[PDB]
Amino acid sequence: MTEYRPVEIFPEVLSDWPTVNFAVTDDVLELGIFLGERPEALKGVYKLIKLKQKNYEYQSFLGLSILFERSDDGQILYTFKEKEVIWEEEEFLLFIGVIDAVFGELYPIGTVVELDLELLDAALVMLAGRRLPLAKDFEAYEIDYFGRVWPFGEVANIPPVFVSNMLIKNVIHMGLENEWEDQMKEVLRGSQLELHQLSTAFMTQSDQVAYLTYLTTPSLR
Amino acid sequence: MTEYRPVEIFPEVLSDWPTVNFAVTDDVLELGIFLGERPEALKGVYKLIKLKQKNYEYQSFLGLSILFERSDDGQILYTFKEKEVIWEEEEFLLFIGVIDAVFGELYPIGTVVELDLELLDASLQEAPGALVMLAGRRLPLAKDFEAYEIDYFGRVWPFGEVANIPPVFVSNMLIKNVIHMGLENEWEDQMKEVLRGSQLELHQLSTAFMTQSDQVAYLTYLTTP
Amino acid sequence: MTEYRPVEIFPEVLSDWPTVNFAVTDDVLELGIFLGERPEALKGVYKLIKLKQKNYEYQSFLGLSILFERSDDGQILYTFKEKEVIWEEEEFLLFIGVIDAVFGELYPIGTVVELDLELLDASLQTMLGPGALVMLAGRRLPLAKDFEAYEIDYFGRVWPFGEVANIPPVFVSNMLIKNVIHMGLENEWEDQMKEVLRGSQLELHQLSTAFMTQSDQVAYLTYLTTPS
Amino acid sequence: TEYRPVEIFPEVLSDWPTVNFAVTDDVLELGIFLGERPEALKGVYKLIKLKQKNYEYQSFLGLSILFERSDDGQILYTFKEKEVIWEEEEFLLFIGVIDAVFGELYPIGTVVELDLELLDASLQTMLGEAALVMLAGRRLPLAKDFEAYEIDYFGRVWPFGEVANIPPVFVSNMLIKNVIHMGLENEWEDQMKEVLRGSQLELHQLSTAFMTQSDQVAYLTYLTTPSL
Ligand SMILES: [Cl-]
Numbered sequence: 001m002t003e004y005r006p007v008e009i010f011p012e013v014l015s016d017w018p019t020v021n022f023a024v025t026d027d028v029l030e031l032g033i034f035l036g037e038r039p040e041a042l043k044g045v046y047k048l049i050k051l052k053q054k055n056y057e058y059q060s061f062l063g064l065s066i067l068f069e070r071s072d073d074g075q076i077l078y079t080f081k082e083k084e085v086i087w088e089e090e091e092f093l094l095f096i097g098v099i100d101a102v103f104g105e106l107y108p109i110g111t112v113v114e115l116d117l118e119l120l121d122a123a124l125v126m127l128a129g130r131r132l133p134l135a136k137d138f139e140a141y142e143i144d145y146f147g148r149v150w151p152f153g154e155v156a157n158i159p160p161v162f163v164s165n166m167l168i169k170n171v172i173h174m175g176l177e178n179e180w181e182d183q184m185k186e187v188l189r190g191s192q193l194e195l196h197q198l199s200t201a202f203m204t205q206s207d208q209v210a211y212l213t214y215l216t217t218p219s220l221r
Numbered sequence: 222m223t224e225y226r227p228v229e230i231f232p233e234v235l236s237d238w239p240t241v242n243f244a245v246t247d248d249v250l251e252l253g254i255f256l257g258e259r260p261e262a263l264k265g266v267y268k269l270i271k272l273k274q275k276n277y278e279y280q281s282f283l284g285l286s287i288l289f290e291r292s293d294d295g296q297i298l299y300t301f302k303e304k305e306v307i308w309e310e311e312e313f314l315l316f317i318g319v320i321d322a323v324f325g326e327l328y329p330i331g332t333v334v335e336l337d338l339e340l341l342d343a344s345l346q347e348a349p350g351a352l353v354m355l356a357g358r359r360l361p362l363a364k365d366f367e368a369y370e371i372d373y374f375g376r377v378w379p380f381g382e383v384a385n386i387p388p389v390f391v392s393n394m395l396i397k398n399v400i401h402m403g404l405e406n407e408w409e410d411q412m413k414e415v416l417r418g419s420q421l422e423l424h425q426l427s428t429a430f431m432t433q434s435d436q437v438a439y440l441t442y443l444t445t446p
Numbered sequence: 447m448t449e450y451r452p453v454e455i456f457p458e459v460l461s462d463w464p465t466v467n468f469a470v471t472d473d474v475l476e477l478g479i480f481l482g483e484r485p486e487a488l489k490g491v492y493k494l495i496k497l498k499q500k501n502y503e504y505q506s507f508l509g510l511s512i513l514f515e516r517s518d519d520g521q522i523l524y525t526f527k528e529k530e531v532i533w534e535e536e537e538f539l540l541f542i543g544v545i546d547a548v549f550g551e552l553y554p555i556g557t558v559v560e561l562d563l564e565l566l567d568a569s570l571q572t573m574l575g576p577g578a579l580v581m582l583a584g585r586r587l588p589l590a591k592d593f594e595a596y597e598i599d600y601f602g603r604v605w606p607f608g609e610v611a612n613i614p615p616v617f618v619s620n621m622l623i624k625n626v627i628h629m630g631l632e633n634e635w636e637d638q639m640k641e642v643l644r645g646s647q648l649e650l651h652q653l654s655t656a657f658m659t660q661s662d663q664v665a666y667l668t669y670l671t672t673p674s
Numbered sequence: 675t676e677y678r679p680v681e682i683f684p685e686v687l688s689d690w691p692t693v694n695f696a697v698t699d700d701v702l703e704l705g706i707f708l709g710e711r712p713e714a715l716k717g718v719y720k721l722i723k724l725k726q727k728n729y730e731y732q733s734f735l736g737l738s739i740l741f742e743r744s745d746d747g748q749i750l751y752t753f754k755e756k757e758v759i760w761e762e763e764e765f766l767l768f769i770g771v772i773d774a775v776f777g778e779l780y781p782i783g784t785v786v787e788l789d790l791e792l793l794d795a796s797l798q799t800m801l802g803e804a805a806l807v808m809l810a811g812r813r814l815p816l817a818k819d820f821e822a823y824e825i826d827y828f829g830r831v832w833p834f835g836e837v838a839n840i841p842p843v844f845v846s847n848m849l850i851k852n853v854i855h856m857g858l859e860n861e862w863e864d865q866m867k868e869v870l871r872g873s874q875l876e877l878h879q880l881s882t883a884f885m886t887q888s889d890q891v892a893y894l895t896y897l898t899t900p901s902l
Contacts, residue, residue: 109835110783110808112858124446126783126858128810129835132385143385146836149443151782151863154811154828154836156374156611157362158443159388173858176785176808176832180673184833187674212347215386218379218635219351330608331556331581333631352631354556356583357609364873374609376583379636381555382609383584383601383838404558404605404628408579408900412606415902419818446862563898566800571891577898587838601838604897612814612825613897614801614842670831671805 002182006103007033017098017196019140022091027080035096036103039165041066042096046166046201047119049076049093090204097202101192104144104165104199106130106185108175112150115161116169124172125161126150131188134200138211142197164201225414227324228254230421235319238424240368243312248302256317257324262287263317267394267429268340270297270314311432318430322421325372325393327413328355329403333378336389337397352378352400353389359416360390362428366439370425392429448641452548453479459648463544468537477526480510481542482549487512488542489562492621492656495522495539496565536659543657547647550599550620552640554630557582558605561616562624578624580616581605586643587617589655593666597652621656677871679775680706686775686875692767692822701768704753708769709776714739715769719848719883722749722762724795763886770884774874777826777847777881779867783857784809785832786850793849797882804841806832806854813870814844816882819902820893824879846883 011029014020035042041058048056048070059065068078076087087095107113111127128147133139145163152158175181191197203211232250235241256263262279266289269277278288290298297308308316328334332355338346357374361367373391376382403409419425431439457475460466468474481488487504491514494502501515514524520535533541553559561578563569569577584601588594600618603609630636646652658666684702687693695701708715714731718741721729730740742750747762760768780786785808793803810829815821827845834840857863873879885893895901 109833110785110855110857112783123444124858127835128830129837134385135380146385148810150858151446151866152443153782154611155363156357156360156388156609157371159390162385162387173783175783176855181833183674215377215380216347216349216351220349221633221635330603330606331558331628331630333556355608356603364869378631379555379639381584383587401556401631403556404581408576409606411900411902415818446860571894572898576900584838590839598839607897611811612817614797614844616800617841667803 002186006036010036010099010102013102013193014098017094019094019196020098022088022095027085028095031080032095032099032103036099039103039105042099042103043116043166043169046096047116049089049096050119050166050201093202093204094198097198100165100199100202101197106189107145107168107171108177108181108184110173111171111175112173113145113163113168114170114172115163115167119167119169124150125163126153127163127175128154131192135211135214137214138207139195140198141200141203141207142192144199144201162200164199166199166201222411223414225417227257231257231320231323234323234421235316238319240315240424241319243309243316248304248306249316252301253316253320257320260324260326263320263324264337264394265289266297267317268337270310271340271429314430314432315426318426321393321430322426325427327358327417328373328396328399329405329409329412330356330358331401331403332399333401334375334391334396335398335400336391336395341395353391354378354381355391355403356382359420362439363442366435366442367423368426369428369431369435369439370420372427372429390428392427394427394429450641450644452482455648456482456548459548460544462648463651465540468533468541473526473529473531474541477524477531478541478545480512480526482545485549485551488545488549489621491538492542493562493565495520495535496656539657539659540653543653546620546654546657547652550644550647552585552644553582553600553626554632554636555582555585556628556630557626558628559618559626560624561618561622565622579605579627580618581608581628582618582630583609583615586647588652590666590669592669593662594650595653595662596655596658597647599654599656617655619654619656621654679709682875683709683772683775686771690771690878692878693771695764695768700753700756700758705768705772707753709772712776712778715772715776716848717741718749718765719769720789720792722766723792723848723883766884766886767880770880773847773881773884774879778850779870780809780812780827780850780853781857781859781863782809782812783855784853785855786827786845787852787854788843788845788849789851793843796849797844801841801843804831804843807843807845808832808835808855809845809857810836813874815879817893817896819896820889821877822879823882823885823889824874826881826883844882846881848881848883 010032014024044056044058045068047053048068053070055067055069057065057067071077074089076089076092078085107127109127109130112124113127114123115125126147127145130145132143132146134141143162144165146160148154148160149158231253235253236245265277265279268274269289269291274291276288276290278286280286287301288299292298295310297310297313299306333352334355335350336353338350353375355373356376360371360374362369371390372393375389375391377386380386456478460470481491490502493499494514494516501513503511503513505511512524512526514522516522522533522538524531558579558581561580562575563572563578564575569575580602582600582602587598587601589596589598598617599620601615602618603615604613607613683706717729717731720726721741721743728740728742732738739751739753749760749762749765751758785806788807808829809827812827814825814828816823816825825844826847828842830836830840830842
């Protein structure tokens with residue numbers, strides 16, 4: 001209950017996720033456990049998908065590295081046990097999306113973080129609000145964090161920043177943590193997995209264009 | 222109480238402006254009252270400068286045609302009243318800023334307007350544009366930056382404030398058409414005079430007329446930490 | 447395109463509300479229709495219960511001057527159809543709650559309205575109750591988790607100040623809107639939203655924060671103060 | 675080379691235009707005594723705002739000082755075996771300048787515990803009370819024609835943050851009871867304190883907790899009525 005077991009709850013949550021329609025093998029389950037306990041590699045692969053990079057290698061703390069290439073046709077390609085493994089770009093983005101929904105860190109309010117400038121839809125941002133719901137008909141997504149630029153705060157001249165788990169690169173100042181915060185983390189994480197909510201960073205191609213029309217349709221009068 | 226006469230206050234305000242240290246000829250003032258009562262030309266030359274357009278021409282309702290050419294040397298070329306006048310781009314942008322500070326409209330709260338999608342980063346923001354309801358007015362930038370102001374603070378119609386949509390900083394040069402005018406009574410008229418009375422007494426301009434020297438200075442002001 | 451007759455849906459919606467433990471006679475229906483078609487009396491009745499007043503009558507040229515008086519015990523007393531009817535305080539609070547959910551008005555974003563300064567606090571400094579001009583920046587705000595029985599009708603700023611961020615916002619309910627002054631933008635989308643929004647509150651059996659019972663009002667204070 | 679509030683305090687009083695008080699040394703040493711003791715500077719504020727009879731600052735022999743107050747608006751104290759009586763409005767502006775010099779500046783994200791019994795007697799009004807509050811915005815100018823007043827802090831309820839259902843609360847330093855958490859503090863945050871304190875004292879501003887009764891009713895009518 002209080003102790004979090006993201007490893008044991010990972011395989012069942014992946015199967016309970018309704019949008020999952022790809023092959024789920026033991027290696028697929030093992031790949032999420034490796035990337036789950038190492039978000040620095042999980043976020044580096046998201047940049048491979050979001051920024052359409054050519055490849056990305058994750059060097060361990062020892063020195064050995066693991067290569068993950070991206071095909072220009074829209075597909076993630078790598079080799080497990082020295083054997084080729086294919087992953088569609090729309091299916092692999094959902095894979096790393098559920099990992100962040102399970103192995104993602106819930107930072108408290110007031111946590112001063114440093115967003116990755118390369119993933120800012122193209123310095124220091126304090127987290128003022130977390131896990132805000134999206135609009136109706138888009139309950140499958142959520143804004144992980146959101147806040148103002150530190151230390152200016154709620155000055156309307158400074159526009160707010162929508163921060164996902166993939167945008168946070170470095171944590172500078174941790175927020176307040178106590179028994180209420182841990183209770184707030186538990187009751188908020190369960191709803192993020194119960195309603196099958198993904199981060200807005202893992203928005204698919206069709207959901208991106210459809211959400212733009214949702215904004216323009218009322219004014220399309 | 223006091224009826225606002227932008228044509229009467231324009232000559233004294235333009236001369237009392239501290240940053241104004243350039244030509245204040247009679248034709249210059251005659252051009253300000255011409256662009257003030259004709260907002261379609263005040264915003265058109267603004268698009269000529271900001272969007273780096275080649276030229277721009279405007280005809281009045283009676284046929285008064287004036288052509289504004291933008292030289293590659295950064296000079297505003299135009300011929301007005303049988304006389305050709307050159308205007309440095311870093312100085313002509315300040316000239317049209319005082320015009321908007323005197324002749325600019327002051328829409329009430331809740332005014333659903335349409336924005337000029339051409340000026341405001343089109344693909345960053347789809348063809349007709351989503352409507353913006355002016356929910357705020359006259360917003361200061363920061364300390365040591367009181368020389369510029371945010372004209373309007375807008376939410377996206379009809380989603381509102383509670384909706385998790387990024388807000389929009391709107392300016393008079395940015396507002397294209399007015400789709401729905403807000404409530405305007407005696408409290409609103411005195412609020413217009415209170416806001417405009419402070420924007421001209423403190424010698425403030427809009428962020429649309431922010432010089433590139435000050436635009437980068439405002440970026441490093443918040444990047445210093 | 448489908449028009450809305452709140453009188454037709456009124457009795458079956460009263461059956462949809464499960465918390466009903468009071469006697470729902472036909473006189474209860476006609477009284478709600480009387481309070482529904484005439485929101486001028488429905489709101490004054492709410493002030494009789496919330497502010498613990500002596501009485502309140504709705505003088506009308508049609509002669510339907512129904513006087514509503516409540517005792518110290520919280521017993522709403524009136525006479526309808528030439529017959530004396532007695533109601534309780536907490537039961538009459540939930541009675542007008544369904545009326546407001548069925549006969550409630552939906553104003554678009556940017557609708558500048560007037561508010562009643564009497565319900566809020568002791569505004570004797572004003573001594574008028576040219577006051578409380580508030581523009582509606584948001585509508586139908588869900589209250590909170592485990593509190594879906596109630597909801598915030600409107601969320602807006604003080605007019606003509608706007609989102610000044612130096613004056614705190616106002617959570618406006620339909621029982622607080624004093625008088626409508628300006629109307630927002632209305633198109634096919636707005637009327638489409640009005641048609642689907644008023645049916646969702648009746649679907650989820652939601653009330654307004656004005657009808658917040660003390661037990662649930664304290665329960666909301668525990669959620670804001672006591673951890674979990 | 676750091677802040678010397680004890681040294682600047684007598685210079686600020688000379689600079690302060692609103693001061694209509696005697697420039698005696700007893701007032702100087704008493705303000706410095708209250709400046710280095712927040713429990714005493716904030717305790718007498720509860721004696722005046724909540725309109726209490728007496729209040730004693732129990733401490734060492736001599737350090738212990740009692741503050742009595744009658745109903746006709748007169749404060750009473752004795753400092754160094756010397757009895758001095760201040761008027762209620764004369765003693766409010768006195769502690770207001772002390773909180774402007776010896777006031778504490780907290781960084782962003784500082785979760786503070788508030789004095790709830792003093793909160794109820796404030797601008798609660800429609801906003802309600804709304805325990806733990808995080809400081810999101812600091813030093814907000816009150817308004818025009820009220821520039822001499824400032825809002826020390828304002829934020830949301832912890833750990834909810836900016837939520838549409840969560841009403842924001844404006845927090846003065848006199849309202850801060852206990853400090854639970856602390857925000858990030860680099861050298862820019864220290865520079866911000868030099869920028870903020872160099873502005874509040876130069877513009878001669880006071881916290882909204884020190885709003886005089888003449889300006890309290892005047893600010894309320896400005897929001898409600900088109901009086902100006
Ligand atoms: Cl408050």
